[PDB]
Nucleic acid binder design. Structure first.
Ligand SMILES: Nc1ncnc2c1ncn2[C@@H]1O[C@H](COP(=O)(O)OP(=O)(O)OP(=O)(O)O)[C@@H](O)[C@H]1O
Ligand SMILES: Nc1ncnc2c1ncn2[C@@H]1O[C@H](COP(=O)(O)OP(=O)(O)OP(=O)(O)O)[C@@H](O)[C@H]1O
Ligand SMILES: Nc1ncnc2c1ncn2[C@@H]1O[C@H](COP(=O)(O)OP(=O)(O)OP(=O)(O)O)[C@@H](O)[C@H]1O
Ligand SMILES: Nc1ncnc2c1ncn2[C@@H]1O[C@H](COP(=O)(O)OP(=O)(O)OP(=O)(O)O)[C@@H](O)[C@H]1O
Ligand SMILES: Nc1ncnc2c1ncn2[C@@H]1O[C@H](COP(=O)(O)OP(=O)(O)OP(=O)(O)O)[C@@H](O)[C@H]1O
Ligand SMILES: [Mg+2]
Ligand SMILES: [Mg+2]
Ligand SMILES: [Mg+2]
Ligand SMILES: [Mg+2]
Ligand SMILES: [Mg+2]
Lengths: 343, 343, 343, 343, 343
DNA sequence: GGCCGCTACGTATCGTAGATATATCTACGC
DNA sequence: GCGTAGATATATCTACGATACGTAGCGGCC
């Protein structure tokens, strides 16, 4: 069958909810972005940053998880022979309790996340304030200053040598007090990547575009991947969105499969084409239906757990500005050639 | 009988006042908002915020308490088997005697309230400046920097994993020094809610609307629940107001039940439809009557403890703007569809 | 006799002056406002603020003292059975040297005043900086940060459970530099009151009309009590003024009682209703007479130590303004009817 | 053959990728810059700085590696006879987390990098906080103040006496707080160089022109080497770029040698004449074409890993203004003569 | 002969380069300044500061070295009889990493530099924190507060009694943040000179003029020696420069003596008449010629190792700026006579 | 005359060294 | 024979200085 297993109807609601939660769909944009990211990670070729832009609800975190899993699987056969190697390390950036992104916490959290291997790996981190304990947890005291933590993290990264160092919610790097400090933050990250040779991938919303082009050096060593949404203007994206809706409705564990392609306009209006928004909206509707033990879904039910027009209107304002800034037109190439004198 | 028990008359005045205080009425808006909130808490589906708005004397705190008690009673069977579980952690915000919102105090208050289980549960939380004592209290020294407290709170929340984290009178988060810092405050809370995977519910008045829609990501990860007041224009709200007035009249521990529905216009004038304000009014009047040991109530007694016109006028000014902001019309849908191209 | 005992004549002038000073006459406004406040603080019913409004001489301080003494008397039988309870505590706001009202000093003075019971009650207050001493005083180290003092004061307030917290001269809270600071001062007070569940009565002059109505929450959770002065328009007010004046005349410890009711116009001119102004004016005149032992009082004696016109009109400007804002007319009532739709 | 070894086609993908990566092409600009740098390092003649300006892709780091290798080779036969001497020490500047550059970390890391000889070499540097360990690595305590580290580093430099002291990514020196502090930073570097008599070479992007001629004293002891890119206005640079493209396509390990000189305009458009960027582009394209096992490179393949137009547009912006500062014209000579009176 | 020794042509390049670098030419300005400095050093007569101003290239360091060597040779006969007497002690000024000149480092460096005789002198300095070691190099337990180290330096200076204390690049004293702190620095140096009674000679660039006559006390107690460069308006210095060029071309270890007299304008343009800069230029050109084994110096060779016009323009920009400050005219005499009334 | 932007200053905070409490080894006086 | 004294190293507390941020008062513009 092309849908959910029919056996799940007999099971209680918890397994149905879980099955729908763990189910993931493949859509053209996700596949394309995944391929590009994997190709970039495999041969960075002197690139230290991968800025993965995308709206909220597009699949950035799911993409990161998929890439992480595939990298781990790929590195497993070699990990059998060679040890002290982590295939990929991922951390999520923290919004600071202030207007400035503290770096000490970032360093210590990176050290914690990177260093949770089998205890057999001993590498005697530099600086004396960082050590192991009785429970295998990294001990970092307030004794150590930020440069010391940075040195320890650099040595650890060089020793472990992960393929890529994922940083999720990278927009939080933009919490600075000074405008030039915005470039300075990325310069610090660039130096960290340069002196360890570990590829850094930044995943964030369209407010990460403040980091897009700043200093030529950073522009040279950054790869821009755009996780674009499904627009309504292009008929192909509409067809793709409808296919996603069709497979979602096929995969909804209900006694009766509802008709979702019919109200595709409503889904687009309340999701803006983001597959994640559609997925979690359908998750809410399905949870409600399972709680009510209702064989199927109604538009009303969709209207209950939809997103407010005000919510979506703010979404499209940011998405509109994000895509406008990331727009490459043939006219732009003309100025570049004209400026370069190649006209 | 559908009213107060008759045997209370023989018992003294204090227990009568206590009975009226402990008495709670059920009205359509309360039950609707309660069911919506319970459904949202049962599954967030990638949401980290619930912004429950509403006027004053509307039952937000009572709704919170009801939700907490319901969730606790739901979780008790599983608590009997699995230890180290707190179903709901509910906290109220603190208005800084100054300007900025003290995050350190928020974190330490969270640690204090969250960790009051049976002493058997020990988790030697990260950072060495937080520990138990000889009375079971949590000791937080001033030496512990705010990010350390954040890490400790994150660990505790991750282990205990409450279903929902209530932040009452959340409008106190607006006490900030920088205008843009509103979004920063909300981002800090979002980041705290991301890595812990704990649903944050922000209980607040209409002043909380300043946080209502800032950035797309916060829009995606928030649901807006509106505790609307019983308006006067819609006849059904008038019927509900009269019904709750009659219900209150029936459960007034007096020798003679006063006729209360007749003067409903006065009650609406002073309570603006908020059930809480009406309950306060009737509590004051009952206390006065029981002090005078009078058989029944009169409009006079009502006017003594009535809210004055001036203070009541300010409330409606706040309510009028709040409801206007939170009003979604069919027209607003049209611009959203027009902008997207779904016309 | 209804007047001073005749035995005071033999006693020296100091004793007579003391007898007249500690004497406190009762007037209809005094008893009315006293009963209203008693009934308001007998149960607050979700009101956290009491705003006793009154000009110079209404008798706010003496009303506070009367209320404290009454409740202290009322609580003796329970105190004999239950320890660790203070019936009522109260302080006076400090006008800060600097621009901003100092919350640290307020908190520390509140802690000092509240915590002076018999030394048996030990409650091991939070914060290491707070404890007892060799002399039984509470020592507060300057190293203690403000939020820590607030938490300690909160715990003390919760444990001691006072019936009402008096803040005399509350107009001193208005010393702020930001327009919104005016409000979040009162918000901090409200948060302190809510978190402790202790009614906070604010006795202050007509300058407190600044704090009258700010936001719906503080508009709802506050009840306004107006200590109106005896005006001249109302014949009942004039009769009460003359009765109080006659009682004052009868209660002068003088060899021969002078006729005081004749110059009622002069007295009202120089006191404009404030009973306290009349009382301390008469204290002044009686002391002056006793210095010379003059068997009586004359018009020039009153004129010698009256209130000058320059100041006297100044109170009128303030008083008529406050009475203007505190005036609720039928026009305002019908304005609420129209706006709310109950016309 | 003038092309790549034809045996590589039998080898797997990794070998071919490694061969292409390890290929270093010789082009006129690199040759001339290398010769000038060798000449200026052979004898400083009262110079302490070599400023090597180069855009992001000129081959600054590969030039540093080449000169390092050559210096080591030239020092080798006397190194067999003379010990306690390192030919060259190579370091890279660290972008600080804070606003200002951290000199303590610079000093300690300089000591770390310079001090990795065989364990036999014992000097016993000044200050008690610096020593060896059981693994032979220098351990630096956190308690050592910056001047002490500076003194120890000076002693180490005067003992080892390296020919040159490479500070890569020297752009990070410009992160300071005070405007004038640039001069102080460069003077600190000059002072470090002077006592040790060690020629420092600073490699950085066109941003490093902020340090160019900020002081006459610093202007005297600095040599400006410009690592110019290939222009398009000059036919000679165009022909050189064409020749280098021919050499690259000649040595690409593919079954069919692709034709690249046709779209020289395209290659210039996305590389601005930078050689490193072109090499990285071709490395990524080769990796892609070698994953699909394709016997050639297709245009669309170049379009896949080409830098964004926005990235290249800005790189020209900083290059164009950078070259403008570095432009020497006959007009400047005439103004010098007029100012000097030599006209 | 008036040229270089002829037998060096048979010798390898290294010997010729060494001969050229070790050869020192004598020119009128150097001789005049040298004799003035020697006369001043012979007797200070109440002057505690010898301010030697000169551009970067005038030959300040070589003049200092020659003066120190001459004083050492003069004091050899007395040193043979009298021990514990250093004739001349000279240290270098350290540019500080922070914005403040570190006086502690200056004091300890002065002590370590001055205290390097054979181990027989056991002076037993004041303060317990400073002592010898096995290797003879003293160690200063950082603990030692800076003023105690200063006092130890005072004792060392009065015991050893050097003739002059040389400080190179004394403009490094000017790195402060407070405007009036310049006077404080100079006052500290003057005090250190006073009780020690040791003439302090400061040599630095034209930016040393910031402490020229910053106060009357320092103005009187300091005499200034100007190390003027060679100008162009005056034919005398032009002829001197011509003679210097002729001597250098006669002393070049080459087979053919190049004609440097033709391009005297070019040499003056690219050296600004600084003998040191010209010497370094010729050193570079000679090294290149020896590398190419060319029996001559071709013009283009001079352009290869010349200085950028931007560098030279910055040279002359600061040279002319300081010269007008250091210009004394007869016009400045008349007002001084007029102001005193001496006119 | 009113409102907005700048900036000068207080102040919390954090780095930082170095005073010090103390543990441990060894010698010696009781 | 043994306990205690003396010396010393070491981390950790603590005092002090540097710094970035809030912020109110004051100058400028409509
Ligand atoms: N292709 C997909 N298939 C199924 N679920 C998906 C897919 N893409 C996203 N999701 C759902 O989206 C949620 C994960 O968040 P997602 O990565 O979509 O958010 P995002 O907006 O891109 O990033 P952020 O967390 O920064 O807002 C999960 O509920 C996940 O199931
Ligand atoms: N449905 C109800 N039935 C009975 N009493 C109610 C009800 N709703 C509110 N109350 C009364 O209101 C008081 C609790 O405050 P309430 O929850 O109304 O405040 P709120 O306005 O929603 O919140 P806030 O304090 O933020 O303004 C109690 O006295 C409670 O008895
Ligand atoms: N009813 C009264 N009988 C006798 N004396 C009175 C009475 N009311 C006030 N007083 C006198 O007034 C003085 C106390 O000041 P009072 O409380 O009247 O001032 P107020 O202006 O109302 O308030 P505040 O203390 O804020 O200025 C005392 O001397 C007291 O004796
Ligand atoms: N002549 C060359 N031959 C081969 N590879 C080269 C050459 N020049 C540069 N590269 C390549 O360039 C990369 C090294 O970086 P490169 O020195 O070009 O950077 P840069 O821009 O000068 O400096 P930065 O690292 O500061 O941006 C390597 O991938 C190297 O293979
Ligand atoms: N008269 C001279 N004869 C030979 N060499 C000289 C002469 N004057 C200066 N030099 C050369 O100049 C260099 C010494 O530096 P010099 O004192 O000239 O520099 P400065 O700019 O005056 O001072 P600084 O750089 O220390 O501020 C040496 O290479 C030395 O050989
Ligand atoms: Mg996501
Ligand atoms: Mg409430
Ligand atoms: Mg009073
Ligand atoms: Mg490079
Ligand atoms: Mg010199």
């Amino acid at each position: 069958s092309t849908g959910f297993p029919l056996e799940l109807l007999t099971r209680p609601a918890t397994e149905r909810l879980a099955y729908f939660e763990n189910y993931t769909v493949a859509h053209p944009r996700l596949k394309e972005v995944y391929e590009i990211l994997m190709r970039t990670i495999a041969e960075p070729a002197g690139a230290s940053f991968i800025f993965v832009y995308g709206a909220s609800g597009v699949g950035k975190t799911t993409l990161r998880l998929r890439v992480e899993q595939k990298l781990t699987e790929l590195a497993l056969p070699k990990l059998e022979s060679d040890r002290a190697r982590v295939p990929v390390v991922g951390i999520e950036a923290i919004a600071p309790e202030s207007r400035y992104f503290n770096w000490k916490e970032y360093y210590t959290r990176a050290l914690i996340t990177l260093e949770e291997p089998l205890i057999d790996h001993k590498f005697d981190y530099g600086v004396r304030g960082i050590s192991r304990d009785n429970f295998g947890k990294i001990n970092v005291e307030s004794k150590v200053v930020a440069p010391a933590l940075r040195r320890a993290l650099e040595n650890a990264l060089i020793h472990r040598h992960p393929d890529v160092f994922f940083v999720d919610e990278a927009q939080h790097f933009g919490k600075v007090a000074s405008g030039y400090k915005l470039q300075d933050q990325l310069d610090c990250l660039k130096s960290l990547a340069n002196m360890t040779g570990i590829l850094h991938c930044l995943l964030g919303t369209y407010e990460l575009l403040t980091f897009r082009n700043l200093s030529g050096q950073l522009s040279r060593r950054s790869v821009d991947i755009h996780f674009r949404r499904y627009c309504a203007d292009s008929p192909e994206d509409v067809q793709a969105f409808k296919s996603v809706l069709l497979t979602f409705q096929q995969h909804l564990p209900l006694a009766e499969t509802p008709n979702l392609v019919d109200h595709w306009e409503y889904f687009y209006e309340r999701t803006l084409g983001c597959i994640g928004t559609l997925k979690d909206w359908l998750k809410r509707v399905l949870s409600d239906a399972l709680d009510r033990e209702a064989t199927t879904i109604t538009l009303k039910d969709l209207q209950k757990r939809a997103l407010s027009v005000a919510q979506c209107q703010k979404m499209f304002k940011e998405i509109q500005e994000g895509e406008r800034q990331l727009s490459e037109t043939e006219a732009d190439v003309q100025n570049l050639r004209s400026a370069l004198g190649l006209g």
